[PDB]
Structures are given as C-alpha cells and as structure tokens.
Amino acid sequence: MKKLFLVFWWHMHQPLYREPYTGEYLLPWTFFHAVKDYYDMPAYLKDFEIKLNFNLTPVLIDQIQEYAQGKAKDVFLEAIRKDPDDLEKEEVEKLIEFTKLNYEKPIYRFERIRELMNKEKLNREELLDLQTLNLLAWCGRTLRKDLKDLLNKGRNYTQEEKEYVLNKYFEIIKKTLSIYREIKEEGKGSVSTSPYYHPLIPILLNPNCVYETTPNVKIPDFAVSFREDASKHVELAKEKYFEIFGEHPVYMWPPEASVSNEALELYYEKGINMLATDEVILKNSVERASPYLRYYFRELISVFFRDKTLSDLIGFSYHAWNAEDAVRDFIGRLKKIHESVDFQPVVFVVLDGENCWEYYEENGIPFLEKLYSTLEKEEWIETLTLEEAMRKEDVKTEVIESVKAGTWFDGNFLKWIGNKEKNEYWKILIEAKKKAKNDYILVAEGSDWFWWQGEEKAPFVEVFDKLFRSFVRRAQE
Ligand SMILES: C[C@H]1O[C@H](O[C@H]2[C@H](O)[C@@H](O)[C@@H](O[C@H]3[C@H](O)[C@@H](O)[C@@H](O)O[C@@H]3CO)O[C@@H]2CO)[C@H](O)[C@@H](O)[C@@H]1N[C@H]1C=C(CO)[C@@H](O)[C@H](O)[C@H]1O
Numbered sequence: 001m002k003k004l005f006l007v008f009w010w011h012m013h014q015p016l017y018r019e020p021y022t023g024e025y026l027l028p029w030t031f032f033h034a035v036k037d038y039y040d041m042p043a044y045l046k047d048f049e050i051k052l053n054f055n056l057t058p059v060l061i062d063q064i065q066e067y068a069q070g071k072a073k074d075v076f077l078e079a080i081r082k083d084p085d086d087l088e089k090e091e092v093e094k095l096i097e098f099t100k101l102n103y104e105k106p107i108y109r110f111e112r113i114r115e116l117m118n119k120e121k122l123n124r125e126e127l128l129d130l131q132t133l134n135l136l137a138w139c140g141r142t143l144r145k146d147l148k149d150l151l152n153k154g155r156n157y158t159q160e161e162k163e164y165v166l167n168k169y170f171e172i173i174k175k176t177l178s179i180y181r182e183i184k185e186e187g188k189g190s191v192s193t194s195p196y197y198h199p200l201i202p203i204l205l206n207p208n209c210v211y212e213t214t215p216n217v218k219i220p221d222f223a224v225s226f227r228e229d230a231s232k233h234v235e236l237a238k239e240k241y242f243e244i245f246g247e248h249p250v251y252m253w254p255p256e257a258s259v260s261n262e263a264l265e266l267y268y269e270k271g272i273n274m275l276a277t278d279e280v281i282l283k284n285s286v287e288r289a290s291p292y293l294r295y296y297f298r299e300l301i302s303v304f305f306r307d308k309t310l311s312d313l314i315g316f317s318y319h320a321w322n323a324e325d326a327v328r329d330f331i332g333r334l335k336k337i338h339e340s341v342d343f344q345p346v347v348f349v350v351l352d353g354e355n356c357w358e359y360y361e362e363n364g365i366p367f368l369e370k371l372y373s374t375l376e377k378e379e380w381i382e383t384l385t386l387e388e389a390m391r392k393e394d395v396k397t398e399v400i401e402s403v404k405a406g407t408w409f410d411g412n413f414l415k416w417i418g419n420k421e422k423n424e425y426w427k428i429l430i431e432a433k434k435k436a437k438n439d440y441i442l443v444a445e446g447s448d449w450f451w452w453q454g455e456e457k458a459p460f461v462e463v464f465d466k467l468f469r470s471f472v473r474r475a476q477e
Pocket residue numbers: 011012013014015029033101102256352354355447448449451458459460
C-alpha cells in the first residue's frame with residue numbers, strides 16, 4: 001500500500017542563563033522545562049509504538065548536567081526551596097511576578113492560585129502554597145501520575161511536601177539524558193545536535209547572506225571575521241555529542257532553520273550527513289518544489305524541508321483545540337497530502353519541543369497521547385526516525401544546487417539583525433570579538449540575545465540583556 005512517511009523532530013534548546021562571574025542562574029527556564037518537557041517528551045516513546053526524533057543543543061546539555069549534579073545556583077529555585085520565614089521581601093516579589101506572568105497559561109489553572117494572587121498580603125502558609133503550586137504547575141507527564149495525590153490536594157502544602165516535589169524533580173533531571181541515550185540505542189528515535197550555543201551560522205560565515213532575502217536592510221560594519229568561530233560552534237558541538245552518546249553526530253539541526261550556500265558547505269565538511277530547514281526557504285530557493293521529497297544539496301549533503309503549516313499548527317494553533325479535533329485535523333491534512341502526490345510523500349514536522357505545551361490543556365498530554373496513539377493505528381502513516389528516513393528507498397530524491405539564505409522566520413534574518421536595537425548588539429559583538437581572549441565570545445553569538453533585542457518590553461528583557469553584556473565583558477579578559 002502507498003504510505004505517508006511522518007518524521008517528528010523536536011528541538012530542545014536553552015541559552016546559557018549562568019552568569020560567568022557569580023555563577024548564578026539568572027532564569028529558571030532550564031529547570032522548569034527539564035521537569036516538564038526535556039524528560040517526558042522522549043518518555044512518550046516507552047508507551048507508544050511510534051518513532052520520535054529529538055535535537056539537543058550542547059548548551060542545554062551543559063545546563064542539564066549542572067542541574068543534575070546539584071551545582072546549579074538557581075536564584076529563583078532557591079527561593080522556592082527556602083522556608084517562607086527565611087524569604088526576603090525582594091524574593092517574595094519575584095515569586096508573585098513569576099506567577100503573574102504564567103497566570104494565563106492553562107498549566108497554572110489552580111483554584112488556590114486565584115486566591116493567593118487576589119490576596120493583598122500572604123502569610124507563611126500561603127507562601128508555602130505559592131512556592132509549591134509554582135513547582136507543581138510545571139509537572140511533566142511522568143510525575144503527574146506519581147504525584148497525583150499531592151496534585152489533587154491543591155492547597156495546604158507543608159515544607160516537607162514541597163521538598164518531596166523538588167526531590168522527585170531532581171530525580172527526573174538526572175535521568176533526562178539517559179532516556180535520550182536509551183531511545184537512540186533502542187532504535188525508537190534519532191537524536192541530533194546543533195552548533196554549540198545556537199548561533200546564526202550563515203551570518204557568522206558571510207554577513208552578506210542577509211541581503212539574499214532582504215536586499216535593502218542596513219546592518220552594521222563587520223570589521224571582524226566570525227568564520228573561525230562558526231567551525232568552533234560545529235566542532236565543539238560534535239565533541240559534546242560524543243561525550244553523551246559515544247559517537248559523532250551525523251544529523252544536525254541548524255539554529256532557527258537558518259541555512260545558506262556557505263553554511264551547508266561548512267556542515268558537509270564537518271561530517272554532517274543531513275539537516276533540515278523551513279519550506280519558505282524551499283520556495284525561495286527552488287522554482288516549483290515540494291517539501292515532501294528528499295533533497296540532495298549538490299550531492300554533498302541531504303536536506304529535508306519541514307511542513308510549515310503542519311508544524312506551526314502544533315506549535316501555535318492547536319493549543320486552543322480539543323485533543324480530538326486537533327488530531328482529527330492533523331490526520332486530515334496528512335490524508336490530503338497522501339492524495340496530493342503520485343509518489344509516497346515524506347512529511348517533516350519540526351518545531352520547538354517545549355514551548356507550546358504550556359498553553360495547552362494539561363500540558364498537551366491529551367493532545368500528544370491522542371495523536372501518538374492515533375498514529376499507531378493508522379496503517380498508511382509510517383513514523384520514521386531520521387536515520388530510517390535517510391535510508392528509505394521509498395522516498396523520492398531530487399538534486400538542488402543552491403539555497404537562498406534565511407531562517408524559518410519569514411525566510412530572512414530580520415528578527416536578529418536589521419534595526420537599531422539588534423544592530424547595536426552586533427556592534428557590541430563585533431568590537432568584543434576584536435579584543436576577545438577566551439571562548440565566552442561563543443556564548444554571546446547565540447541567537448537568543450539578538451532575538452529579545454528591540455521587539456517590545458517583554459518579560460526578562462533586562463535579564464537577557466544582563467547575561468549577554470556579562471558574556472561580552474568576560475570574553476575580553
Ligand atoms: C522569555 C521566555 O524564555 C524562555 O525561552 C527560551 C525557550 O525555552 C527556548 O526554547 C529558546 O527558544 C528559542 C528556540 O530554541 C528557537 O527555536 C527559536 O524559537 O527561538 C527561540 C528564542 O530565541 O530559548 C528561549 C530563551 O531565549 C521560556 O521558555 C519562555 O516561557 C519565556 N516566555 C515568556 C515571554 C512570553 C511572551 O509572551 C511568554 O511566552 C510568557 O509569558 C513568558 O514565560
């Protein structure tokens with residue numbers, strides 16, 4: 001029978017929140033996503049007979065390991081552990097501000113949270129509830145089953161009960177890297193990596209790549225070559241991947257799907273056999289092309305193009321859907337894809353694996369469990385690992401000679417460079433790399449720092465600015 005090959009590729013990344021001087025983690029997002037998604041996303045493979053593929057950045061692996069060993073000095077987390085009698089007025093404001101930010105998300109829908117947020121002042125026991133419910137709001141699928149009776153209480157938590165939650169959370173973190181090894185060794189999925197600190201590789205090699213799609217943009221003067229650092233990002237990433245999995249990575253996910261002719265050349269030289277990028281890149285690069293086909297880039301590397309609609313549905317749209325209606329729509333589009341082509345199509349669904357579920361009901365567990373079990377019983381859909389997709393003779397293959405440089409955000413680099421606020425950061429980077437002495441200059445090259453520049457007065461913009469400027473200063477010493 002004709003089949004549709006489905007490839008799931010989840011992207012797990014966190015910037016280095018660790019201040020180089022104090023060694024203090026200024027944001028808790030590595031810890032919260034570790035307990036909520038970084039372990040439970042591949043743990044689905046133990047309960048559903050499908051294939052899921054994952055990408056892990058080396059910077060996230062670095063932070064996961066530090067949290068697992070207990071060495072991470074997370075300032076926000078220490079306030080949670082601290083008995084509310086020891087909490088200072090400043091610390092309590094952070095806890096209330098954190099709750100206010102995530103108050104809207106369905107994973108924060110606790111009746112107790114409504115009372116505490118509306119209360120004018122909080123005593124010790126109310127703070128204990130606020131400390132623990134913030135912890136329990138980020139419970140993953142695995143620990144939601146184990147900590148069920150605690151989560152049904154919903155209030156009146158003791159300090160020891162809180163510490164039990166932290167203890168169970170740190171057991172998950174220590175096991176998080178093990179399951180990624182486990183799924184890769186057992187053949188249930190393929191695990192890939194990215195250049196170390198999630199940098200924009202095409203910009204590092206040739207900053208002129210921005211003019212490929214946005215010709216009239218004004219970028220700062222790049223008086224320095226970042227081309228050698230772009231190899232350092234790739235080379236050190238493969239070395240870190242070797243530490244975890246005992247082998248060099250053959251598959252890589254370019255950060256922000258950003259690709260270029262020169263970027264693909266550098267990936268090929270470093271032993272990368274396959275990567276993926278956005279289908280808006282496909283439309284800019286190839287005349288009349290389909291994303292449902294394996295692509296040979298100049299007979300050097302294999303490239304796959306994600307389905308932007310299918311991926312953006314999971315990451316942005318389905319959060320406001322019932323689990324049944326969401327999966328029914330998702331399968332319905334695949335059936336339309338199945339009928340639309342005379343060949344057997346391969347569909348690449350690639351997106352961030354941790355940031356959409358916060359806005360789903362029950363962290364999207366009903367959505368994922370319904371979709372994963374639905375895909376199991378659909379015979380015409382064959383979930384494939386990245387390695388399986390690369391050796392599959394049933395997928396059509398085409399040869400392309402060039403790509404127009406750009407990210408998955410509108411096919412251009414404007415979200416990271418182009419306006420005064422973003423251009424100013426690159427001038428800071430360019431001048432710092434002129435006097436850079438150590439490798440902390442690599443951390444400052446991450447796309448996240450330039451992501452949050454300008455845009456708006458979003459939460460933690462001051463914190464991200466503080467981290468980037470601290471890394472720039474440390475690189476010059
Ligand atoms: C402020 C924001 O911080 C967190 O974000 C990090 C994500 O967890 C990571 O996935 C990573 O995102 C990058 C992706 O890897 C990449 O594929 C591309 O999408 O770019 C992303 C950013 O460059 O790194 C992020 C930090 O830079 C945290 O998880 C998230 O919850 C936080 N969001 C807050 C701000 C808003 C804006 O409305 C809302 O999401 C929430 O109210 C806040 O929690």
